[PDB]
Enzyme design. Structure first.
Site, PDB file in Angstrom:
ATOM      1  N   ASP A 188      18.134  50.401  -4.603  1.00 14.64           N
ATOM      2  CA  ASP A 188      19.239  49.578  -5.099  1.00 14.64           C
ATOM      3  C   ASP A 188      20.410  49.541  -4.118  1.00 14.64           C
ATOM      4  O   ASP A 188      21.567  49.717  -4.503  1.00 14.64           O
ATOM      5  CB  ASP A 188      19.716  50.085  -6.465  1.00 14.64           C
ATOM      6  CG  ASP A 188      20.574  49.067  -7.200  1.00 14.64           C
ATOM      7  OD1 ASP A 188      20.514  47.871  -6.847  1.00 14.64           O
ATOM      8  OD2 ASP A 188      21.312  49.463  -8.127  1.00 14.64           O
ATOM      9  N   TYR A 216      35.307  61.359  -4.932  1.00  9.00           N
ATOM     10  CA  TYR A 216      36.164  60.175  -4.934  1.00  9.00           C
ATOM     11  C   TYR A 216      36.216  59.526  -3.552  1.00  9.00           C
ATOM     12  O   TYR A 216      36.581  60.170  -2.569  1.00  9.00           O
ATOM     13  CB  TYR A 216      37.573  60.550  -5.414  1.00  9.00           C
ATOM     14  CG  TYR A 216      38.669  59.552  -5.088  1.00  9.00           C
ATOM     15  CD1 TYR A 216      38.598  58.234  -5.522  1.00  9.00           C
ATOM     16  CD2 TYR A 216      39.793  59.943  -4.372  1.00  9.00           C
ATOM     17  CE1 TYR A 216      39.609  57.327  -5.231  1.00  9.00           C
ATOM     18  CE2 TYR A 216      40.808  59.047  -4.077  1.00  9.00           C
ATOM     19  CZ  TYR A 216      40.710  57.742  -4.510  1.00  9.00           C
ATOM     20  OH  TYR A 216      41.719  56.854  -4.218  1.00  9.00           O
ATOM     21  N   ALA A 217      35.833  58.254  -3.487  1.00 12.41           N
ATOM     22  CA  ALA A 217      35.901  57.482  -2.249  1.00 12.41           C
ATOM     23  C   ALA A 217      37.148  56.601  -2.254  1.00 12.41           C
ATOM     24  O   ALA A 217      37.200  55.596  -2.963  1.00 12.41           O
ATOM     25  CB  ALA A 217      34.650  56.640  -2.074  1.00 12.41           C
ATOM     26  N   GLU A 252      28.065  46.630  -3.546  1.00 14.16           N
ATOM     27  CA  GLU A 252      28.803  47.267  -4.636  1.00 14.16           C
ATOM     28  C   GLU A 252      28.503  48.762  -4.729  1.00 14.16           C
ATOM     29  O   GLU A 252      29.291  49.529  -5.285  1.00 14.16           O
ATOM     30  CB  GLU A 252      28.485  46.599  -5.977  1.00 14.16           C
ATOM     31  CG  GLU A 252      28.601  45.087  -5.979  1.00 14.16           C
ATOM     32  CD  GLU A 252      27.264  44.405  -5.775  1.00 14.16           C
ATOM     33  OE1 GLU A 252      26.844  44.251  -4.609  1.00 14.16           O
ATOM     34  OE2 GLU A 252      26.632  44.027  -6.783  1.00 14.16           O
ATOM     35  N   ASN A 253      27.360  49.172  -4.187  1.00 18.83           N
ATOM     36  CA  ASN A 253      26.947  50.570  -4.245  1.00 18.83           C
ATOM     37  C   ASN A 253      27.189  51.308  -2.934  1.00 18.83           C
ATOM     38  O   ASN A 253      26.696  52.419  -2.736  1.00 18.83           O
ATOM     39  CB  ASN A 253      25.472  50.669  -4.635  1.00 18.83           C
ATOM     40  CG  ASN A 253      25.229  50.311  -6.087  1.00 18.83           C
ATOM     41  OD1 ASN A 253      26.139  50.380  -6.916  1.00 18.83           O
ATOM     42  ND2 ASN A 253      23.996  49.935  -6.407  1.00 18.83           N
ATOM     43  N   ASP A 288      25.355  55.472  -6.338  1.00 18.03           N
ATOM     44  CA  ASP A 288      24.574  54.888  -7.431  1.00 18.03           C
ATOM     45  C   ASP A 288      23.073  55.098  -7.240  1.00 18.03           C
ATOM     46  O   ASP A 288      22.362  54.198  -6.795  1.00 18.03           O
ATOM     47  CB  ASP A 288      24.883  53.393  -7.574  1.00 18.03           C
ATOM     48  CG  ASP A 288      24.429  52.825  -8.907  1.00 18.03           C
ATOM     49  OD1 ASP A 288      23.794  53.562  -9.690  1.00 18.03           O
ATOM     50  OD2 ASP A 288      24.708  51.636  -9.173  1.00 18.03           O
TER      51      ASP A 288
HETATM   52  N1  LIG Z   1      33.150  57.847  -6.335  1.00 13.76           N
HETATM   53  C1  LIG Z   1      33.736  56.631  -6.474  1.00 13.76           C
HETATM   54  N2  LIG Z   1      34.924  56.352  -5.890  1.00 13.76           N
HETATM   55  C2  LIG Z   1      35.510  55.147  -6.024  1.00 13.76           C
HETATM   56  N3  LIG Z   1      34.984  54.132  -6.733  1.00 13.76           N
HETATM   57  C3  LIG Z   1      33.795  54.271  -7.371  1.00 13.76           C
HETATM   58  C4  LIG Z   1      33.093  55.561  -7.271  1.00 13.76           C
HETATM   59  N4  LIG Z   1      31.957  55.440  -7.982  1.00 13.76           N
HETATM   60  C5  LIG Z   1      31.934  54.183  -8.493  1.00 13.76           C
HETATM   61  N5  LIG Z   1      33.027  53.485  -8.133  1.00 13.76           N
HETATM   62  C6  LIG Z   1      33.304  52.079  -8.524  1.00 13.76           C
HETATM   63  O1  LIG Z   1      32.687  51.825  -9.789  1.00 13.76           O
HETATM   64  C7  LIG Z   1      31.671  50.827  -9.665  1.00 13.76           C
HETATM   65  C8  LIG Z   1      30.441  51.195 -10.483  1.00 13.76           C
HETATM   66  O2  LIG Z   1      29.925  52.452 -10.057  1.00 13.76           O
HETATM   67  P1  LIG Z   1      28.339  52.710 -10.172  1.00 13.76           P
HETATM   68  O3  LIG Z   1      28.089  54.197 -10.196  1.00 13.76           O
HETATM   69  O4  LIG Z   1      27.663  51.834  -9.147  1.00 13.76           O
HETATM   70  O5  LIG Z   1      28.062  52.078 -11.628  1.00 13.76           O
HETATM   71  P2  LIG Z   1      26.638  51.457 -12.066  1.00 13.76           P
HETATM   72  O6  LIG Z   1      25.654  52.573 -11.821  1.00 13.76           O
HETATM   73  O7  LIG Z   1      26.836  51.125 -13.525  1.00 13.76           O
HETATM   74  O8  LIG Z   1      26.465  50.256 -11.166  1.00 13.76           O
HETATM   75  C9  LIG Z   1      31.348  50.739  -8.184  1.00 13.76           C
HETATM   76  O9  LIG Z   1      30.952  49.417  -7.811  1.00 13.76           O
HETATM   77  C10 LIG Z   1      32.648  51.145  -7.526  1.00 13.76           C
HETATM   78  O10 LIG Z   1      33.468  49.984  -7.380  1.00 13.76           O
HETATM   79 MG   LIG Z   2      23.406  52.789 -12.276  1.00 22.16          MG
HETATM   80 MG   LIG Z   3      26.303  50.261  -9.090  1.00 26.63          MG
END
Ligand SMILES: Nc1ncnc2c1ncn2[C@@H]1O[C@H](COP(=O)(O)OP(=O)(O)O)[C@@H](O)[C@H]1O
Ligand SMILES: [Mg+2]
Ligand SMILES: [Mg+2]
Ligand SMILES: COC(=O)c1sc(-c2cccs2)cc1N
Ligand SMILES: [Cl-]
Ligand SMILES: [Cl-]
Ligand SMILES: [Cl-]
Length: 265
Positions: free
Chosen positions: A130, A86-87, A134-135, A148
């Site tokens: 990628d 968790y971030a 957002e990632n 991601d």
């Molecule tokens: N470990 C995490 N802690 C907090 N927020 C997260 C975490 N993982 C994902 N998120 C939120 O969820 C969104 C989508 O996560 P992600 O794994 O990138 O999905 P996708 O692979 O479908 O793009 C991210 O842009 C972020 O805002």
């Molecule tokens: Mg993905």
């Molecule tokens: Mg993503």
């Protein structure tokens, strides 16, 4: 091993193309984490099971303070669950929308943290492919963490999957469907450095077709407030020819980086 019954679910952290991410707490240990939920119908429909296994395989074996941990996974009749670190400070994307632009110190620090994480990945011939705001997530001390890994592979590679959304962070060789290697992440690093300082990516346009044109021709200009040192680093990273893009150590020891970064290599 793990099942849904082992967790108490909290507020939504974010949404992706496939992923719905929730805050969660493991019942017996009170361990706080993030639960990435994917729908199997969805996964089968798009035919991206191979991407998901790569995400699990690659990320669970990586260990670096600037890379988000993946602890494990489980699934039921309809969904797949990825257990993530968790971030707590959210995404760089949200921080950018909040501040409009980053200063040179914040930017150089982020780039240093990114280059450190990418250097680790490339030492195992792992390419992310990628990298975008957002990632990029933020830890409790505000440190950057790459997440991601659904598009990550081993170099060299082609592309057997359909490009989904934005072209803004992809290099010419990638959007043209040619073979590619580690240098794709360095192109993306250049795109990010620009966006951090300016507030928008260098090849942004109204249409997919127009964006494609600007990328393949490497058409970008700098606003007046972008300093000389920043322009030098960005211009070196955004080369059409992959082989002329610098190595990651050259980025980490670039004079503009060393002068403005608050973190070491
Ligand atoms: N470990 C995490 N802690 C907090 N927020 C997260 C975490 N993982 C994902 N998120 C939120 O969820 C969104 C989508 O996560 P992600 O794994 O990138 O999905 P996708 O692979 O479908 O793009 C991210 O842009 C972020 O805002
Ligand atoms: Mg993905
Ligand atoms: Mg993503
Ligand atoms: C229709 O089922 C699916 O698409 C998938 S993906 C998957 C996994 C992906 C990564 C680890 S396990 C399990 C099932 N069952
Ligand atoms: Cl391939
Ligand atoms: Cl692919
Ligand atoms: Cl290097």
């Amino acid at each position: 091993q793990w099942a849904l019954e082992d967790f108490e679910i909290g507020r939504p952290l974010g949404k992706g193309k496939f992923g719905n991410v929730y805050l969660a707490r493991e019942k017996q240990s009170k361990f706080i984490l993030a639960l990435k939920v994917l729908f199997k119908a969805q996964l089968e429909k798009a035919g991206v099971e191979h991407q998901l296994r790569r995400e699990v395989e690659i990320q669970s074996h990586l260990r670096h303070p600037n890379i988000l941990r993946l602890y494990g996974y489980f699934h039921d009749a309809t969904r797949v669950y990825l257990i993530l670190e968790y971030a707590p400070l959210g995404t760089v994307y949200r921080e950018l929308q909040k501040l409009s632009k980053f200063d040179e110190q914040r930017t150089a620090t982020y780039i240093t943290e990114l280059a450190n994480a990418l250097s680790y990945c490339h030492s195992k011939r792992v390419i992310h492919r990628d990298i975008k705001p957002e990632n990029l997530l933020l830890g409790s001390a505000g440190e950057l963490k790459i997440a991601d890994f659904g598009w990550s592979v081993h170099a060299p590679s082609s592309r057997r999957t359909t490009l989904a959304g934005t072209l803004d962070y992809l290099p010419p060789e990638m959007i043209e469907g040619r073979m590619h290697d580690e240098k794709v992440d360095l192109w993306s690093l250049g795109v990010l450095c620009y966006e951090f300082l300016v507030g928008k990516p260098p090849f942004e346009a109204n249409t997919y077709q127009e964006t494609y044109k600007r990328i393949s021709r490497v058409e970008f200009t700098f606003p007046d407030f972008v300093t000389e040192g920043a322009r030098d680093l960005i211009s070196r990273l955004l080369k059409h020819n992959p082989s002329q893009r610098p190595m990651l150590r050259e980025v980490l020891e670039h004079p503009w980086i060393t002068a403005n970064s608050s973190k070491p290599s």
